[PDB]
């Protein structure tokens, strides 16, 4: 486990605590979100991010932050503003970037 992986695993646990219901925990399927694979070209979720840390696939916090922002941007694109998913995505994107930029 490198010092960079450890940093990223710490950031991921803290980000996942902001999603207590697990809405971002695993990939969104078309069965639960009709037309999702048509609308969202580059899906992302926390479980995929955790796997990428473990695989040593992030070179920097910067590349980690981009996967987090992609996850949140996808939820704000697919879901209408007045939904629980849109609201959480907008909220945790802002609070998560602030947390990582302290």
């Amino acid at each position: 486990s490198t010092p960079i992986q450890q940093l990223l695993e710490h950031f991921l646990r803290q980000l996942q605590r902001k999603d207590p219901h697990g809405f971002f925990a695993f990939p969104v399927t078309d069965a639960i979100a009709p037309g999702y694979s048509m609308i969202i070209k580059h899906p992302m979720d926390f479980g995929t991010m955790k796997d990428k840390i473990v695989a040593n696939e992030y070179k920097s916090v910067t590349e980690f932050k981009a996967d987090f922002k992609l996850m949140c941007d996808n939820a704000m694109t697919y879901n209408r503003p007045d939904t629980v998913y849109y609201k959480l995505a907008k909220k945790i994107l802002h609070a998560g970037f602030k947390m990582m930029s302290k």
Binding site: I32, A33, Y78, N79, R80, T83, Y85
Partner: peptide, 4 residues
């Protein structure tokens, strides 16, 4: 719409 979306997830309902």
């Amino acid at each position: 719409g979306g997830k309902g």
